[PDB]
Amino acid sequence: RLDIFGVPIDRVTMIQAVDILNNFLQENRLHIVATPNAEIVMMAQKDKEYMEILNNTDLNVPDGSGIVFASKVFKPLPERVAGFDLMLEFIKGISSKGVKIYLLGAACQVAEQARANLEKLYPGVKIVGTHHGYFTEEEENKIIEEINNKGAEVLFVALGAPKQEKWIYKNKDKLKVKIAMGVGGSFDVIAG
Amino acid sequence: RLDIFGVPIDRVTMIQAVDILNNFLQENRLHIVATPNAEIVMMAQKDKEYMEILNNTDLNVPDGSGIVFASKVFKKPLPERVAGFDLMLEFIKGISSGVKIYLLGAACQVAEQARANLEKLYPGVKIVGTHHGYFTEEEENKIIEEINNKGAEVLFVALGAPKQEKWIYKNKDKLKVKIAMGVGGSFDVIAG
Amino acid sequence: ERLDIFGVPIDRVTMIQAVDILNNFLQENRLHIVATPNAEIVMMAQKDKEYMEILNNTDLNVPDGSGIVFASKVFKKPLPERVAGFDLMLEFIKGISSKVKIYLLGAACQVAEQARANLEKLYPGVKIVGTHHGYFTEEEENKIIEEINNKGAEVLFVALGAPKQEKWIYKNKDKLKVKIAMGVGGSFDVIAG
Ligand SMILES: O=c1ccn([C@@H]2O[C@H](COP(=O)(O)OP(=O)(O)O)[C@@H](O)[C@H]2O)c(=O)[nH]1
Ligand SMILES: O=c1ccn([C@@H]2O[C@H](COP(=O)(O)OP(=O)(O)O)[C@@H](O)[C@H]2O)c(=O)[nH]1
Ligand SMILES: O=c1ccn([C@@H]2O[C@H](COP(=O)(O)OP(=O)(O)O)[C@@H](O)[C@H]2O)c(=O)[nH]1
């Protein structure tokens, strides 16, 4: 772990991050995964709540070449671990074992379209549920109950930074998933 | 107002920016709203025309953590990150309960999938018209006639920076709307 | 006439100049690799030796992104303007649309196809001979390359994202029979919508 401007970044490779995520699936508790970049670290400077959340996440992966370039001053970061690429690699691995995934986030139809694209890419992928990221506080509890009841183990949150990390942290004791990871615009790129 | 590398940035919070926009609706003249970030501020360095436009806009909101981090050097730094996408949604949220909105910009059907989405999110929202942002100089005057005749008060321009600010500025005396704001890729994220 | 911005060579060209360069590339019977470096790309090249080697071997590196253009202000001869990759791609197509077989490779399912339908409506006369998504397998790779070659494509726009797009073009540089091969990032997604 190297603390880049208050935000702790885990000194892991793409392979190492993927292995950490699989190991997290063996523990029956929620693990918060975040992919900090230059924008995220800058957001943490002004936002004390956001920085507190980052300092409490299970894995902070070095998304973005900015952080990796800055780390060259320090034992620097081994490689750029992209959040989109990590999500796809982690999903690729876990489709063969049938781990229940839930997609929460983005505009209407984006999550169902990404689910369709991921099924075509990774045959045997178990995406147990989807919901858009434009829900209200009243709708929030019904989405949480849906995830919990559907038996979801991996939850990908595409609400954008800091919204995704803040949502996961606020509901950390309400969610019964093994991994909860902020993915941002990831659902938009795969759905098109 | 902070002078970040020649570009004036308004020292406002999310709430303050929304209230400013609501008050702009009470003045019978066009108000140009821009959401500068590090990419925009850097564009202004080499583009004198663009920097002149940004020094002539009614409200420059600090979108992007870069500007907000840079402001930490000043005696009076910026209070928070006021994201352009988040501002556009919060403003629409308030005025939905019947201010006439027009969506101009993005590829074919994006502005229309955006409109349909905003109508589902904010019931009662009056989006009086939409047009794609890939129009010709001939088509330009028919769009401007459409906005003016349809009685639009708020105009969201999704042409990208600096294209959106330059389009608004060039047509500042041809448009009969109270607010004209550059929203870049806000239309694609809400449409999905 | 080239600026070494942190190991990555950037061509000191304007929007017009870049377009003319591309039009002249069409007169040479060999593949030309076009890349649009920005601060993210430039930074990716620092840790990725393979990627920096590719960027030092491309035919045209256009100044996409204000960061590079701002950094260049330090040099005796700075960069004249930003040459945005999306804007370059559209201006180039605009021209060649009246005359040139284009192939769109990249992005999610139906994105390249919707980008083709939109470019056909924007630039009437545009000859887009084929499209394919960018989530293909190594087995599917050769059928796409055969499709591009057999359909007689001259211009190939690769929307795979940096560094994936430049690495794909470079790895297949001697397998592709096109005159121009350019990394266009998320350009297909903005035009398709
Ligand atoms: O209340 C919101 C606001 C946005 N979004 C989604 O969040 C993503 C924002 O992507 P962005 O690139 O801005 O985030 P980043 O990669 O910086 O974290 C998009 O898919 C939006 O549709 C959402 O689901 N809920
Ligand atoms: O001639 C143009 C060029 C662009 N756009 C739209 O403007 C946005 C381009 O912005 P981008 O995603 O590149 O990011 P930004 O520069 O705003 O940060 C997209 O909605 C495009 O479809 C448009 O309507 N007309
Ligand atoms: O293996 C992959 C991964 C991504 N993409 C596409 O590559 C683009 C990535 O866009 P991005 O904005 O991340 O790239 P940049 O502008 O930084 O080069 C999107 O259209 C994705 O759908 C693809 O075709 N193949």
Residue numbers in the entry:
A (entry chain A): 3 to 76, 78 to 195
B (entry chain C): 3 to 99, 101 to 195
C (entry chain B): 2 to 100, 102 to 195
Published text:
The TagA N-acetylmannosamine transferase catalyzes the first committed step in WTA biosynthesis. TagAΔC contains the highly conserved amino acid region that defines the WecB/TagA/CpsF family, but lacks 49 C-terminal residues that target the protein to the membrane (see below).
The crystal structure visualizes the enzyme-product complex, as steady-state kinetics studies of B. subtilis TagA have shown that the enzyme operates via an ordered Bi-Bi mechanism in which UDP-ManNAc binds first and UDP is released last. The complex crystallizes as a dimer of trimers in the P21 space group, with six molecules in each asymmetric unit. The coordinates of the apo- and UDP-bound forms of TagAΔC are nearly identical (RMSD of 0.18 Å), suggesting that the enzyme binds UDP through a lock-and-key mechanism. In each protomer, UDP contacts the β7-H8 motif within the Rossmann-like fold, as well as the C-terminal edge of strand β5. The uracil base is engaged in pi stacking with Tyr137 (β6-H7 loop), while Asp191 (H9) contacts the ribose sugar. However, the C2 hydroxyl group in each UDP molecule forms a hydrogen bond with the backbone carbonyl of Val192 (H9) located in the adjacent subunit, which may explain why the complex crystallized as a trimer. The trimeric oligomer observed in the structure of the complex is presumably an artifact of crystallization, as AUC experiments using the native TagAΔC performed in the presence of saturating amounts of UDP indicate that similar to apo-TagAΔC, the UDP-bound protein fits best to a monomer-dimer equilibrium model rather than monomer-trimer or dimer-trimer equilibrium models (Kd = 3.5 ± 0.4 μM in the presence of 10:1 UDP:TagA). As UDP is a competitive inhibitor of the UDP-ManNAc substrate, it is likely that these ligands bind to the same site on the enzyme, such that the ManNAc moiety within UDP-ManNAc is projected into the pocket where it can interact with the conserved side chains of residues Thr37, Gln167 or Glu168.
